[PDB]
Design an enzyme around this catalytic site. Structure first.
Site, PDB file in Angstrom:
ATOM      1  N   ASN A  90       1.760   5.488  -5.967  1.00 52.04           N
ATOM      2  CA  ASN A  90       0.852   4.656  -5.187  1.00 52.04           C
ATOM      3  C   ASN A  90       0.059   3.718  -6.091  1.00 52.04           C
ATOM      4  OD1 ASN A  90      -0.091   5.067  -2.039  1.00 52.04           O
ATOM      5  ND2 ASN A  90      -1.607   3.990  -3.295  1.00 52.04           N
ATOM      6  N   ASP A 189       3.138  -0.306  -3.274  1.00 46.49           N
ATOM      7  CA  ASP A 189       3.288   1.087  -2.855  1.00 46.49           C
ATOM      8  C   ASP A 189       4.649   1.287  -2.189  1.00 46.49           C
ATOM      9  OD1 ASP A 189       2.622   3.722  -2.519  1.00 46.49           O
ATOM     10  OD2 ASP A 189       1.492   3.386  -0.671  1.00 46.49           O
ATOM     11  N   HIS A 345       7.432  -2.613   5.589  1.00 47.25           N
ATOM     12  CA  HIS A 345       8.105  -2.501   4.306  1.00 47.25           C
ATOM     13  C   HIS A 345       9.613  -2.549   4.516  1.00 47.25           C
ATOM     14  CE1 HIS A 345       5.810  -2.068   0.637  1.00 47.25           C
ATOM     15  NE2 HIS A 345       4.884  -1.372   1.271  1.00 47.25           N
ATOM     16  N   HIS A 379       4.540  -5.872   0.416  1.00 47.99           N
ATOM     17  CA  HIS A 379       3.688  -6.867  -0.227  1.00 47.99           C
ATOM     18  C   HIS A 379       4.533  -7.834  -1.048  1.00 47.99           C
ATOM     19  CE1 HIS A 379       0.425  -4.244   0.988  1.00 47.99           C
ATOM     20  NE2 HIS A 379       0.973  -3.253   0.310  1.00 47.99           N
ATOM     21  N   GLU A 404       0.918  -7.460  -7.464  1.00 52.93           N
ATOM     22  CA  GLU A 404       0.004  -6.324  -7.356  1.00 52.93           C
ATOM     23  C   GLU A 404      -0.194  -5.720  -8.735  1.00 52.93           C
ATOM     24  OE1 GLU A 404       0.510  -3.854  -4.063  1.00 52.93           O
ATOM     25  OE2 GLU A 404      -0.738  -2.210  -4.809  1.00 52.93           O
ATOM     26  N   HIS A 406      -2.311  -2.894  -9.446  1.00 53.75           N
ATOM     27  CA  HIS A 406      -3.179  -1.768  -9.118  1.00 53.75           C
ATOM     28  C   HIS A 406      -3.333  -0.788 -10.278  1.00 53.75           C
ATOM     29  CE1 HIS A 406      -5.533   0.735  -6.616  1.00 53.75           C
ATOM     30  NE2 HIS A 406      -4.973   0.418  -5.462  1.00 53.75           N
ATOM     31  N   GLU A 449      -4.228  -6.425  -3.415  1.00 53.93           N
ATOM     32  CA  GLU A 449      -4.975  -5.460  -4.216  1.00 53.93           C
ATOM     33  C   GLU A 449      -4.751  -5.685  -5.715  1.00 53.93           C
ATOM     34  OE1 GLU A 449      -7.651  -3.656  -3.612  1.00 53.93           O
ATOM     35  OE2 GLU A 449      -7.271  -3.708  -5.771  1.00 53.93           O
ATOM     36  N   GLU A 525      -5.170  -4.478   6.443  1.00 58.94           N
ATOM     37  CA  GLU A 525      -4.720  -3.095   6.492  1.00 58.94           C
ATOM     38  C   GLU A 525      -5.805  -2.264   7.153  1.00 58.94           C
ATOM     39  OE1 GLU A 525      -3.414  -1.417   2.721  1.00 58.94           O
ATOM     40  OE2 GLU A 525      -2.226  -3.223   2.348  1.00 58.94           O
ATOM     41  N   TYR A 526      -5.456  -1.583   8.240  1.00 57.85           N
ATOM     42  CA  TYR A 526      -6.405  -0.714   8.922  1.00 57.85           C
ATOM     43  C   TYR A 526      -5.630   0.324   9.715  1.00 57.85           C
ATOM     44  CZ  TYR A 526      -5.776  -2.340  13.737  1.00 57.85           C
ATOM     45  OH  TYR A 526      -5.271  -2.610  14.986  1.00 57.85           O
ATOM     46  N   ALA A 527      -6.342   1.386  10.101  1.00 52.07           N
ATOM     47  CA  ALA A 527      -5.812   2.464  10.939  1.00 52.07           C
ATOM     48  C   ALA A 527      -4.584   3.112  10.295  1.00 52.07           C
ATOM     49  CB  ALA A 527      -5.506   1.960  12.353  1.00 52.07           C
ATOM     50  N   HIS A 528      -4.836   3.822   9.195  1.00 53.70           N
ATOM     51  CA  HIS A 528      -3.795   4.501   8.433  1.00 53.70           C
ATOM     52  C   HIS A 528      -3.071   5.534   9.288  1.00 53.70           C
ATOM     53  CE1 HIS A 528      -2.035   6.097   4.619  1.00 53.70           C
ATOM     54  NE2 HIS A 528      -2.298   4.870   4.210  1.00 53.70           N
ATOM     55  N   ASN A 585       3.773  11.344  -9.280  1.00 50.84           N
ATOM     56  CA  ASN A 585       4.084  10.977  -7.908  1.00 50.84           C
ATOM     57  C   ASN A 585       2.933  11.366  -6.996  1.00 50.84           C
ATOM     58  OD1 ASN A 585       4.778  13.913  -6.896  1.00 50.84           O
ATOM     59  ND2 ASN A 585       6.099  13.587  -8.679  1.00 50.84           N
ATOM     60  N   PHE A 589       2.607  10.367   0.293  1.00 52.84           N
ATOM     61  CA  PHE A 589       1.883   9.162   0.676  1.00 52.84           C
ATOM     62  C   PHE A 589       2.805   7.996   1.045  1.00 52.84           C
ATOM     63  CE2 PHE A 589      -1.590  11.573  -0.543  1.00 52.84           C
ATOM     64  CZ  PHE A 589      -2.781  10.885  -0.469  1.00 52.84           C
ATOM     65  N   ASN A 592       3.622   6.624   6.075  1.00 52.44           N
ATOM     66  CA  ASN A 592       2.440   6.162   6.786  1.00 52.44           C
ATOM     67  C   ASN A 592       2.804   5.367   8.032  1.00 52.44           C
ATOM     68  OD1 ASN A 592       1.118   6.994   4.248  1.00 52.44           O
ATOM     69  ND2 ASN A 592       1.808   4.998   3.493  1.00 52.44           N
ATOM     70  N   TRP A 987      -7.849   9.073   2.525  1.00 55.74           N
ATOM     71  CA  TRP A 987      -8.458   9.560   1.298  1.00 55.74           C
ATOM     72  C   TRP A 987      -9.937   9.880   1.453  1.00 55.74           C
ATOM     73  CZ3 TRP A 987      -5.235   5.458   1.870  1.00 55.74           C
ATOM     74  CH2 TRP A 987      -5.820   4.219   2.148  1.00 55.74           C
TER      75      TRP A 987
END
EC number: 3.2.1.23
Lengths: 1011, 199
Positions: A90, A189, A345, A379, A404, A406, A449, A525-528, A585, A589, A592, A987
């Site tokens: 991730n 991710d 994705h 992404h 990205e 991250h 991100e 990005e919302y509501a995982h 790893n 995750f 989703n 998280w």
């Protein structure tokens, strides 16, 4: 020269990016998008070899393929063929953090292909090869001669072989590297795969070519007259007789056309582009493009002579729409958009990230049938056929650059460094140049991100300078920087503030009211929706509909990224991170999504469909107020179907056609609803049914539903006096109650219902006890491992308080026989390390009619964390094929996610009661249940139940759904009160305070009888 | 209405229904348990229709025959509080005179309610459990009919209204329904327990 360890070089002898090319030699073939013989597909059987390092590759491979090399298909990823283990991570990088250097042990894939070239291609014109995607960097050889080098993974790489191809047999040698300096901008991710995962093709062009073509549209305030501006570029020689015709067609009818000789307007002091021409086409009353009505035009550009001989014709799909922002509102064709998007994705069910047309169309159909009108290319830039299908079917596209970072510390380590500016420049500008002619692409994006650096905002307004027709957004830096026109936070909650240092995620309602803020807010990005998730979606969409500047968001994400593994017997099973030997790893995750890997819908997809309806309903008296949320279309393929039910029994129904203007209001007057004198509840359910079959839906598709509560008849009748009274027998350790055929047994040592007897058949394998603990959900665990403990997680708070370890202590257990009953009183307490957490006092009343009544009163301490459940636990000894329940359904619902479930009589098989989450957890719960029937048993009252073949304990211990084994009998958990699941993020504790079991004293009643 | 004597108790079961013009609005089923220690237990289970407007109160009503000078209660206080207005009240042991229990609003209405009460003592009587109570010399009916606080007259004995659940009062405005949906008694099924004993 190690070009994969240098950010200063990202390409060698690579042609410029452009919109997509077919090189037609006939305008009629270009108009209807027939395949062109000038464009050859090189996908097929290729020769592949694997090496642990690029230096280990022998130089004899440049002349001929190795005899030990295997044969694979292209496009494919060699990780799925056993040559390596795919890594998922991730945040942390799969390699050491030392930019721009990659480790010496670099996995290398050598692709080889032999083929034939027609001699007509070599005599005239230029022949070029296109690599639609290679992960990550590759060196290209043609006939043993070096051609070029590529670095980007999600954008096409084009090279010239005109001076390299020979007549007859030709060999292409490709050396793909897994890691490169560009991989530091690829910390997205997903499963980190590698190979030639996209199409490879050969394209032939004439000597004088069409270099690039820009298409732009300009409207007035009423959108009745449109101007089509076409910028045309050429590569090759400049002659006076070359002419360009841009023709617009609707179906087979020409709308407008224009012919101009080459030469542009004077731009600067000593002239303009002599190789660029401008065409302005006037369209009268154009058909505007939108997600509702995807009206498209075919623009065919052609390069021909003044005598009319055509040299080359290129075509594209043109949609007449405008996206612009004024007064802090994102407007499409003058109307404020309400984005119903979802993150997507590129994850094939069987081929990793090898994407085909079939799964693309299946994805678009599943998204449109579930009321999604937008998609975020996350992404990375996508396969160019995806944008074409988004034009054809009508989905908004947010194009995102494949950037990205991250894994650096801090986040803006590379993006503020000017040395990495060329890399992200070629990674942004090429994608802008490629996908600027797609009307589905409405919002540009810099990446996801990567913090806030100067290079980011520099590229942002580079896109503003080059393409002003589309807004462009960016996340990094707190979603409030100067690099965005749209405020786009990750997982910002509706109401509760989370003020992190220097990047605060305010609540969206408070965010829009910040001083000096004017931009609209669309959640990137919302509501995982990670497993059993997506709670509080109703709150998000109520906030979206109430607020004008809250224009929706993108749900993360669409599909689970799970790979198929095989057991010892060859049965396939989905696997997550760490199942391939990869270290490190993030364990599961990668799941989703709202659908499974095989595109099987989750129960959360029904809630996402219900909360995104384009029709809103309001019941006032006996009238129904239908409000349309469509912005451009009239309700011409919908009808309203109402039905009145008394406790699952239908009484009245009918169909009404719908005639609502876009963003209109219509009144439906229902006939005289029936007025029953029998006990029960009257529920009015309305559905919007599409009679005709659209291009994305079938005939009879349901798009919206809503259900209310009408007048009620409370039961005041009395049960008849039973002639038989239950016999109570007192033993030294047992209490047994007889009613003849029915026998109950209570164990005095444990204080619970020990056994029940119908004739001679035992009914329970374990005694009826309490249950204050559920299997931990994915949102419940958080980011806590066994090695690293997160004290803020719910499961760690419960196991630290001993909720999973508390033992029941018997306090009192008394029995007494009544006049027409036998009364059982018990009282227990759960204690952990001397601290009493829960105290429950039950009252079992055994009536002479056969029904037995359970009244539970539970005292819960609040210093301990709030329990996830207050209910009963038992295991039935009978496995029944069908389960009947009257309540909300028929899909899985929870206290925070129940707006989509409908109150009715539902009959389902027992296998459909257990949803197959890859990570086992609490699942299958049905809320609002008034009656439950399973085999010979009947439960009545007000409770939340789930029923399965698997115990809660097995769901806790087992980590893979394929390792679960059906236990003997049937497990049942009836819950008087259940705690909500959350879903804002995975998280942090996302359960709202109104869905937490924090009252302290709880009461619920149960009625057990045999039907 | 059934009665039966238990091993160390006498159990009373009752069940009623409130009907208006043939429509049943509320159904309450009580269970009176009379223990040998002297404490008597009241368990109330109320079913409320939702097509009728949500009730302002779910509780008990009685008029004591003894007027006591002091009233002891352990809970939120010492001032008047309500389900939507209780953040200022403090949970402690409060002793107040009976005259301070009735606030003198010029227009008589529901007043003197104390929320979060765990124990209430009045004269020789003691109530325990979780309830919202108010105590005064004036009946609810007199508060409805009388429009001026000076026309109110103290009735014989003492009126007591113990409420398991109470509806919030609102206050955003005085011309529209201002009670929030989270303070309205709209669950449908309600349960509360009472313990009556003499101290």
């Amino acid at each position: 020269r190690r070009d994969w360890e240098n950010p200063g070089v990202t390409q060698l002898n690579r042609l410029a990016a452009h919109p997509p090319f077919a090189s037609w030699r006939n305008s009629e073939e270009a108009r209807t998008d027939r395949p062109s013989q000038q464009l050859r597909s090189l996908n097929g059987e290729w020769r592949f070899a694997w090496f642990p390092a690029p230096e280990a590759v022998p130089e004899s491979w440049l002349e001929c393929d190795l005899p030990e090399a295997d044969t694979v298909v292209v496009p494919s990823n060699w990780q799925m063929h056993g040559y390596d283990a795919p890594i998922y991570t991730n945040v942390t990088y799969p390699i050491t953090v030392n930019p721009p250097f990659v480790p010496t042990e670099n996995p290398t894939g050598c692709y080889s292909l032999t083929f034939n070239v027609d001699e007509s291609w070599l005599q005239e014109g230029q022949t070029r090869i296109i690599f639609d995607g290679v992960n990550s960097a590759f060196h290209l050889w043609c006939n043993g001669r070096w051609v070029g080098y590529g670095q980007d993974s999600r954008l096409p790489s084009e090279f010239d072989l005109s001076a390299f191809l020979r007549a007859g047999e030709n060999r292409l040698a490709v050396m793909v590297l897994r890691w490169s300096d560009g991989s530091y901008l690829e910390d997205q991710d997903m499963w980190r795969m590698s190979g030639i995962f996209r199409d490879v093709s050969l394209l032939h062009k004439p000597t004088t070519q069409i270099s690039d073509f820009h298409v732009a549209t300009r409207f007035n305030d009423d959108f009745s007259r449109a101007v089509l501006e076409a910028e045309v570029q050429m590569c090759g020689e400049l002659r006076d007789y070359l002419r360009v015709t841009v023709s617009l067609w609707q179906g087979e009818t020409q709308v407008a056309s224009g012919t101009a000789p080459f030469g542009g307007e004077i731009i600067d002091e000593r002239g303009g582009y002599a190789d660029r021409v401008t065409l302005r086409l006037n369209v009268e009353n154009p058909k505007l493009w939108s997600a509702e009505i995807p009206n498209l035009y075919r623009a065919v550009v052609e390069l021909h002579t003044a005598d009319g001989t055509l040299i080359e014709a290129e075509a594209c799909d043109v949609g007449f729409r405008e996206v612009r922002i004024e007064n802090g509102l994102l407007l499409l064709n003058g109307k404020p958009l309400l984005i119903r998007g979802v993150n997507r994705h590129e994850h094939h069910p069987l081929h990793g990230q090898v994407m085909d047309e079939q799964t693309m169309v299946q994805d678009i159909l599943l998204m449109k049938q579930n009321n999604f009108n937008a998609v975020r290319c996350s992404h990375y830039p996508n396969h160019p056929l995806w944008y074409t299908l988004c034009d054809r079917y009508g989905l908004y596209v947010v194009d995102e650059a494949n950037i990205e970072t991250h894994g650096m510390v801090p986040m803006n380590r590379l993006t503020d460094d000017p040395r990495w500016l060329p890399a992200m420049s070629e990674r942004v500008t090429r994608m802008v140049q490629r996908d600027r002619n797609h009307p589905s692409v409405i919002i540009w994006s810099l990446g996801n991100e990567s913090g806030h650096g100067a290079n980011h905002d520099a590229l942002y307004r580079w896109i503003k300078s080059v393409d002003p027709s589309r807004p462009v957004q960016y996340e990094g830096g707190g979603a409030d920087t100067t690099a965005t026109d749209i405020i786009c936070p990750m997982y910002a909650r509706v109401d509760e503030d989370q003020p992190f240092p220097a990047v605060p995620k305010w609540s969206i309602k408070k965010w829009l009211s910040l001083p000096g803020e004017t931009r609209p807010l669309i959640l990137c990005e919302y509501a995982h929706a990670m497993g059993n998730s997506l709670g509080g979606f109703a709150k998000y969409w109520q906030a979206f509909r109430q607020y004008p500047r809250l224009q929706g968001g993108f749900v993360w994400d669409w599909v689970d990224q799970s790979l198929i593994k095989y057991d010892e017997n060859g049965n396939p099973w989905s696997a997550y991170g760490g199942d391939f030997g990869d270290t490190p790893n993030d364990r599961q995750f990668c799941m989703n999504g709202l659908v499974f890997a095989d595109r099987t819908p989750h129960p959360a997809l029904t809630e996402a469909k219900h909360q995104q309806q384009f029709f809103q309903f309001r019941l006032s008296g006996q009238t129904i107020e239908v409000t349309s949320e469509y912005l451009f279309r009239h309700s011409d393929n919908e009808l309203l179907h109402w039905m009145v039910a008394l406790d699952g029994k239908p009484l009245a129904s009918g169909e009404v056609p719908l005639d609502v203007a876009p963003q209109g209001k219509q009144l439906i007057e229902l006939p005289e609803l029936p007025q029953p004198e029998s006990a029960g509840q009257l529920w009015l359910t309305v559905r919007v049914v599409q009679p005709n079959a659209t291009a994305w839906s079938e005939a009879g598709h349901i798009s919206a539903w809503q259900q209310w509560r009408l007048a009620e008849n409370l039961s005041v009748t009395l049960p008849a006096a039973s002639h038989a009274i239950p016999h109570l027998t007192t033993s030294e350790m047992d209490f047994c109650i007889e009613l003849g055929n029915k026998r109950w047994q209570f164990n005095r040592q444990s204080g619970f219902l020990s056994q029940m007897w119908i004739g001679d058949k035992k009914q329970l394998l374990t005694p009826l006890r309490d249950q204050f603990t559920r299997a931990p959900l994915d949102n419940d665990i958080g980011v806590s491992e066994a090695t690293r403990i997160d004290p803020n997680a719910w499961v760690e708070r419960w196991k630290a308080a001993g909720h999973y370890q508390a033992e029941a202590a018997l306090l009192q257990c008394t029995a007494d026989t009544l006049a027409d009953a036998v009364l059982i009183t018990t009282a227990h307490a759960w204690q952990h390390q001397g601290k009493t957490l829960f105290i429950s006092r039950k009252t079992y009343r055994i009536d002479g009619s056969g029904q037995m009544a359970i009244t539970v009163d539970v005292e819960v301490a609040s210093d301990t964390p709030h329990p996830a459940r207050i209910g009963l636990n038992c295991q039935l000894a009978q496995v029944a094929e069908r389960v009947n329940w009257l309540g909300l359904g028929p899909q899985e619902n929870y206290p925070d996610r129940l707006t989509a479930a409908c109150f009715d009589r539902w009959d389902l098989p027992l296998s459909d009661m257990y949803t197959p989450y890859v990570f086992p957890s609490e699942n299958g719960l049905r809320c609002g249940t008034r009656e439950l029937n399973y085999g010979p048993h009947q439960w009545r009252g007000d409770f939340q139940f789930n029923i399965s073949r698997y115990s809660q304990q097995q769901l806790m211990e087992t980590s893979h759904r394929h390792l679960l084994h059906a236990e003997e009998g049937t497990w049942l958990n009836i819950d008087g009160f259940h705690m909500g699941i959350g879903g804002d993020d995975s998280w942090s504790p996302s359960v709202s305070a109104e869905f937490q079991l924090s009252a302290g004293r709880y009461h619920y009643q149960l009625v057990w009888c045999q039907k």
